[PDB]
Ligand binder design. Structure first.
Ligand SMILES: CC(C)Oc1cccc(CN2CC[C@@]3(C[C@@H]2C)CN(C)S(=O)(=O)N3c2cccc(F)c2)c1
Ligand SMILES: [Zn+2]
Length: 394
């Protein structure tokens, strides 16, 4: 799928985007690739952080749905007008789809200054689409309207006045064998809403965290290309950081470092990578009682940032952070691997990425099988609110 290799770009820590065209004539837009949301939404009015926006009135193929949408999150929000229009991905399949499109008219702390993207491509399922699950996500429309297989795969490749440029591949409708090495291991998608998975075990430098495995998935664990960090539930983050601190103890970093709010530096090329441990997440296998592990290096969890005030040093940000909404396997995890979102088979595949950052001593790894007799259920059941229970699903 050569035509789709290297079709993603971005700035380190500001997301990966794909170029898309919307309307007739086609309006070129850079769109955030987000497996953690399900709406196709685009800046549609001026904003200080946008180099352009979607102009609905200028598309001959635009159809107004005469319905607005309000999308609040913890860290930001967007609102807009719903409609449909012709959509294509120039470095994607040779097809045009009529998809739903939310024209963003108002937002707060959503767009990022310098990110070079003006919209979002929510690749997750209809269950989490706003306003409700009847608003068909883009990927669902693409599959229904064309002969494109119900699968996509992501190879996110990790990195003085600007942030480092990043690259990647979104292979729509297939798996490209040049993007990975070794075996491709699959973990079941628990439920089709977010790309929800189950973590059965966590090790830091081969050492088991020894927590009740439901703690790893409290309240869920998701694969999210739209999130930079590896985000872990409070108790898990504490145990993990305690362990990384102990292995790296010859270096006494400020508190701000471990909170992910401060860079730590070393003379160029002298970074002591070997004092930092590998992190292994064991994911539920397709077979009962089996698991496989995905192992990341500090090259994935220590994000490179070039200091204006310290240009001659290699500086890093700690990219593991606390969560109150479960585990989020963001770019920190994804950059080590080629990830296959096999929707047709309700499973997620992981293989060692041909582009992952490593050294001469260690590599990111995907290894299995690991067996457990009479394996306990590691899944958490989210308390059901009266509001969600009341929803009908016709
Ligand atoms: C590329 C990254 C760096 O920035 C992003 C900017 C916009 C959307 C996304 C994708 N994605 C990231 C996580 C998300 C939901 C959002 C769609 C869920 N979380 C619970 S959240 O509230 O943090 N939240 C978030 C983060 C920033 C702004 C916002 F409104 C919500 C990422
Ligand atoms: Zn009903």
């Amino acid at each position: 799928f050569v035509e789709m290799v290297d079709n993603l770009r971005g700035k380190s820590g500001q997301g990966y985007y794909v170029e898309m065209t919307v309307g007739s004539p086609p309006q070129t837009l850079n769109i955030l690739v987000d497996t953690g949301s399900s709406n196709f939404a685009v800046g549609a009015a001026p904003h200080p952080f946008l180099h352009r926006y979607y102009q609905r009135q200028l598309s001959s193929t635009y159809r107004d749905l005469r319905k607005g949408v309000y999308v609040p999150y913890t860290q930001g929000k967007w609102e807009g007008e719903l409609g449909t229009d012709l959509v294509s991905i120039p470095h994607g399949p040779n097809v045009t789809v009529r998809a739903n499109i939310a024209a963003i008219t108002e937002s707060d702390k959503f767009f990022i200054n310098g990110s070079n993207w003006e919209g979002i491509l929510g690749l997750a399922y209809a269950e989490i689409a706003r306003p409700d699950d009847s608003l068909e996500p883009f990927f669902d429309s693409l599959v229904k309207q064309t002969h494109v297989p119900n699968l996509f795969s992501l190879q996110l490749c990790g990195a003085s006045e600007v942030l480092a440029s990043v690259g990647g591949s979104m292979i729509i409708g297939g798996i490209d064998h040049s993007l990975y090495t070794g075996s491709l291991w699959y973990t079941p998608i628990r439920r089709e809403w977010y790309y929800e998975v189950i973590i059965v075990r966590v090790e830091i430098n081969g050492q088991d965290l020894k927590m009740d495995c439901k703690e790893y998935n409290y309240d869920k664990s998701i694969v999210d290309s739209g999130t930079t960090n590896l985000r872990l539930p409070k108790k898990v983050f504490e145990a993990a950081v305690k362990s990384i601190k102990a292995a790296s103890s010859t270096e006494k970093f400020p508190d701000g470092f471990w909170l992910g709010e401060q860079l730590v530096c070393w003379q160029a090329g002298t970074t002591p990578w070997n004092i930092f441990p590998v992190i292994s997440l064991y994911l539920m296998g397709e077979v009962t009682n089996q698991s496989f592990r995905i192992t990341i290096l500090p090259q994935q969890y220590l994000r490179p940032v070039e200091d204006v005030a310290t240009s001659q040093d290699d500086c890093y940000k700690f990219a593991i952070s606390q969560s109150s909404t479960g585990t989020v396997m963001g770019a920190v995890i994804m950059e080590g691997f080629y990830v296959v979102f096999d929707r047709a088979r309700k499973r997620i595949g992981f293989a060692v990425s041909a582009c992952h950052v490593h050294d001469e001593f260690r590599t990111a790894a995907v290894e299995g099988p690991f067996v457990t007799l009479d394996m306990e259920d590691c899944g958490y059941n989210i308390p059901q609110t009266d509001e969600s229970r009341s929803h009908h699903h016709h």
